[PDB]
């Protein structure tokens, strides 16, 4: 693509997301989702292989279906209230339609099937954008309409997301599919506390985006998309694999790392609401994510896999480009737990 055209398409994706987050009118929110999808489709097809084309097609189908359901929910809400302002929904079935549409856009468990395939089918930069920036708009809408969501529907979808992200990621040797299933589990963690405290959702989203940015930038730095290709990285740049190991430990929520903060805060906020069984289930289920994170860490940094003879060529060469803000992303994703009370700034 033309660098100017790619910059414009990226800016249009972000501007659709911003239109979603700054509008008080449902039509403009729908417009923002539309603009985001329109600009997003070409960045998925940037490399243009049949895998990229299929990933873009599946993404388009799911997002367009969700957008039509969202518009139908808006129209039912208007039919019963005459209201365009994004606020509590005045109709229950419109609320159900909207919740399902937003979950399908996010990729929650009953609508999760697109996330692994699309993430695998696109490049690591496209996947980084897909699993970080594309979560903002639906989650912001959900935080705005949280006072009218059905807690049972939302909590069901979140628990299923955690379970499926844990189980699906257990079987993966592809790094992009592992990232997608980790993303499903983390979206479940975000959406479980959404009925109770949207500040916890924002906190968890920020921590997850930091970890995902760090991990995807480490993968791009490594040029690895399979677990065996990553197993060669120690023999080229062991610093990258050790940083990746501490980041994976953070993703598993191991104290004293930054990834433990969202789980701990969400468990506390849930127990404040007489919710004890669900947090226990969620914390226990996250051990699956931690298991395949630990498998990746074993294959990458904690042990040394066989290398190749052609790796001696790569030793005499440096990186042409350097990932921006990667050291900051790594420090933020691992070391920020002592700063937890600053979460009140998100209030």
Partner 1 sequence: KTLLHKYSDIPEGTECHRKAYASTSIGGATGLIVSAYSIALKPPASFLEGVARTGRYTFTSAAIGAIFGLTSCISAQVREKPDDPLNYFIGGCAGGLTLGARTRSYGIGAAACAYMGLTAALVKMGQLEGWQVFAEPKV
Partner 2 sequence: MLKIIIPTTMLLPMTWMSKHNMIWINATVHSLLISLISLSLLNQLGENSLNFSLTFFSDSLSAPLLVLTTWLLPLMLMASQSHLSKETTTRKKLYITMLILLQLFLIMTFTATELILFYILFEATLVPTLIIITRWGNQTERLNAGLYFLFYTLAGSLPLLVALVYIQNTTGSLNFLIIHYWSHPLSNSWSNIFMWLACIMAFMVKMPLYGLHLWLPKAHVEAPIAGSMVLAAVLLKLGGYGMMRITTILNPLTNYMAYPFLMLSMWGMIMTSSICLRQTDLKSLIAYSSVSHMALVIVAIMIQTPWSFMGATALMIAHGLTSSMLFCLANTNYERVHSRTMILARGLQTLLPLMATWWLMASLTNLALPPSINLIGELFIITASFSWSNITIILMGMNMMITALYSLYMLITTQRGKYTHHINNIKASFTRENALMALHILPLLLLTLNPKMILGPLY
Partner 3 sequence: PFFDVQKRLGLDLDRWMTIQSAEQPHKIPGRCHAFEKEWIECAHGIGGIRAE
Ligand X SMILES: CCCCCCCCCCCCCCCCCC(=O)OC[C@H](COP(=O)([O-])OCC[N+](C)(C)C)OC(=O)CCCCCCCCCCCCCCCCC
Ligand Y SMILES: CCCCCCCCCCCCCCCCCC(=O)OC[C@H](COP(=O)([O-])OCC(O)COP(=O)([O-])OC[C@@H](COC(=O)CCCCCCCCCCCCCCCCC)OC(=O)CCCCCCCCCCCCCCCCC)OC(=O)CCCCCCCCCCCCCCCCC
Q: Binding to ligand X (CB under 6 A): which residues in 303-342?
A: 336, 339-340, 342
Binding mask 275-314 for partner 3 (x = CB under 8 A): ----------------------------------------
Only segment of 6-14, 158-166, 188-196, 223-231 that touches ligand Y (CB under 6 A):
6-14
Sign of torsion, CA 189 340 343 180? negative
Binding site for ligand 3PE (CB under 6 A): 239, 277, 281
Distance CA(267)–CA(280), nearest Å, equals: 8
The DSSP secondary structure of 259-283, one letter per residue, reads: THHHHHHHHHHHHTTT--HHHHHHH
- What is the three-class DSSP state of 85? strand
Can the peptide bond before residue 121 be classed as cis, meaning omega within 30 degrees of 0? Answer: no
Strand boundaries in the chain, DSSP class E: none
303 φ/ψ angles, rounded to the nearest 5 degrees: -135, 170
Q: Binding to partner 2 (CB under 8 A): which residues in 238-267?
A: 249, 254-257, 260, 264, 267
Residue 50 vs 82, nearer CB to partner 3: 82
Residue 48 vs 80, nearer CB to ligand Y: 48
Residue 116 vs 259, nearer CB to partner 1: 116
The site partner of 277 among ligand X, partner 3, ligand 3PE, none (C-beta below 5 to 8 Å per kind) is ligand 3PE
In 10 A of CB 303, how many CB atoms? 10
Q: Binding to ligand X (CB under 6 A): which residues in 151-210?
A: 203, 206
Distance CA(302)–CA(47), nearest Å, equals: 34
Binding mask 183-222 for ligand Y (x = CB under 6 A): --------------------------xx--x---x--x--
Binding mask 89-118 for partner 3 (x = CB under 8 A): ------------------------------
Q: Which residues pair with 174 in a beta bridge?
A: 226
Q: Binding to partner 1 (CB under 8 A): which residues in 80-139?
A: none
Distance CA(44)–CA(258), nearest Å, equals: 30
Distance CA(282)–CA(268), nearest Å, equals: 13
In 10 A of CB 26, how many CB atoms? 23
Decide: is 22 part of the binding site for ligand X (CB under 6 A).
no
Residue 57 vs 199, nearer CB to ligand X: 199
Q: Which residues lie below 8 Å from residue 265, measured CB to CB, with a gap of 6+? A: 200, 203, 204, 340, 343
List of residues contacting ligand X (CB under 6 A): 203, 206, 336, 339-340, 342-343, 345-346
List of residues contacting ligand Y (CB under 6 A): 1, 3, 6-7, 10, 125, 128-129, 132-133, 136, 209-210, 213, 217, 220, 321, 323-325, 328, 336, 339, 342
């Amino acid at each position: 693509m033309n660098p100017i055209i790619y910059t414009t398409l990226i800016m249009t994706v972000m501007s659709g997301t911003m239109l979603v987050m700054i509008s008080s009118h449902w039509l403009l929110i729908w417009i923002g989702f539309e603009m985001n999808l329109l600009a997003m489709i070409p960045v998925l097809m940037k490399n243009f292989n049949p895998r990229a084309t299929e990933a873009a097609t599946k993404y388009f189908l799911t997002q367009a279906t969700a957008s039509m359901m969202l518009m139908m929910a808006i129209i039912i809400n208007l039919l019963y209230s005459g209201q365009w302002t994004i606020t509590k929904m005045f109709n229950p079935v419109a609320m159900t339609m909207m919740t399902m549409a937003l979950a399908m856009k996010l990729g929650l468990s009953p609508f999760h099937f697109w996330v692994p395939e699309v993430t695998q089918g696109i490049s690591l930069q496209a996947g980084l954008l897909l699993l970080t920036w594309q979560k903002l708009a639906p989650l912001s809408v959900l935080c705005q309409i949280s006072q009218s969501i059905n807690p049972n529907l939302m909590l069901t979808m979140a628990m299923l997301s955690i379970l499926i992200g844990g189980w699906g990621g257990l079987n993966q040797t592809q790094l992009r599919k592992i990232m997608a299933y980790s993303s499903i589990a983390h979206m479940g963690w975000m959406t479980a506390v959404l009925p109770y405290n949207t500040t916890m959702t924002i906190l968890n989203l920020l921590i997850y985006i930091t970890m995902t940015l760090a991990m995807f930038m480490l993968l791009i730095h490594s040029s690895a998309t399979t677990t065996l290709s990553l197993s060669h990285t120690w023999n080229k740049m062991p610093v990258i694999t050790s940083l990746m190991m501490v980041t994976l430990l953070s993703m598993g929520g191991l104290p004293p790392l930054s990834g433990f903060m969202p789980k701990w805060m969400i468990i506390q906020e849930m127990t404040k609401n007489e919710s004890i069984i669900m947090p226990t289930l969620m914390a226990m289920t996250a051990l699956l994510n931690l298991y395949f994170y630990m498998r990746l860490a074993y294959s990458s940094s904690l042990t040394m896999f066989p290398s190749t003879n052609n790796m001696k060529m790569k030793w005499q060469f440096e990186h042409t480009k350097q990932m921006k803000l990667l050291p900051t992303m790594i420090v933020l994703s691992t070391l920020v737990l002592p700063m937890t009370p600053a979460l009140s700034s998100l209030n």
